[PDB]
Design a protein around this ligand. Structure first.
Ligand code: NI
Length: 213
């Protein structure tokens, strides 16, 4: 599951799931959501209490949306295959468990502001400041804990499943092929976690969603 800001015909919305199969992010899972304007200024945003929508005034002037989601704890008993969203300390038969974090960035107006790192624990930062055409490559920097992540594996969600990931270079930089229309890039990491009874792994996913000219 990814958590992302989908740029729809009705305005941006917060989704959790997969591009063709998604549901709104539950409010209790949103740690932060905000926009950045074309001059780099942070714009606050919350979904409306009746209709669940992000504010039009912010959406219309956003350069990029940023989403930070705590997807909580996951585990499953020995002998099962599907994880449930409960910590291993409450699931008899579980011995491992994950704390799952999800981040998303959606670019809606290209310019210098979108190249500024936002401080997401795992982040894809565009190195291009121009709206990409299909067929171009978009250079990106992958960051982890605020520093380049050499060898990060970037997945093109629109490409066939069987496509090898784009591997970031020694500087954590990659030249990602741009496809037509709306597209999503993802990077994930799963790492050991010490000091949490409820999980021995921390899983982090991040994405960059954008639309080609
Ligand atoms: Ni999933």
């Amino acid at each position: 599951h990814d958590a992302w800001v989908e740029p729809g015909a009705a305005g941006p919305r917060l989704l959790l799931g997969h591009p063709d199969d998604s549901a709104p992010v539950p409010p209790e899972k949103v740690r932060a959501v905000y926009a950045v304007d074309a001059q780099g200024r942070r714009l606050e945003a919350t979904r409306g209490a009746a209709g669940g929508a992000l504010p039009t005034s912010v959406a219309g002037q956003a350069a990029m949306w940023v989403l930070d989601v705590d997807n909580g704890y996951w585990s499953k008993p020995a002998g099962s295959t599907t994880s449930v969203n409960r910590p291993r300390t409450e699931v008899p038969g579980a011995t491992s468990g994950t704390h799952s974090l999800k981040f998303g960035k959606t670019i809606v107006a290209w310019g210098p502001a979108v190249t500024r790192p936002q401080g997401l624990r795992l982040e894809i930062v565009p190195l291009g400041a121009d709206e990409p055409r299909a067929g171009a490559t978009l250079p990106v920097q992958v960051l982890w804990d605020g520093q380049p992540l050499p060898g990060a594996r970037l997945v093109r969600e629109g490409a066939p499943r069987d496509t090898p990931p784009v591997e970031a270079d020694a500087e954590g930089r990659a030249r990602v092929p741009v496809t037509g229309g709306r597209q999503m890039l993802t990077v994930g990491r799963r790492l050991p976690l010490a000091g949490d009874p409820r999980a021995d792994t921390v899983a982090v996913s991040t994405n960059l969603v954008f639309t080609a000219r």
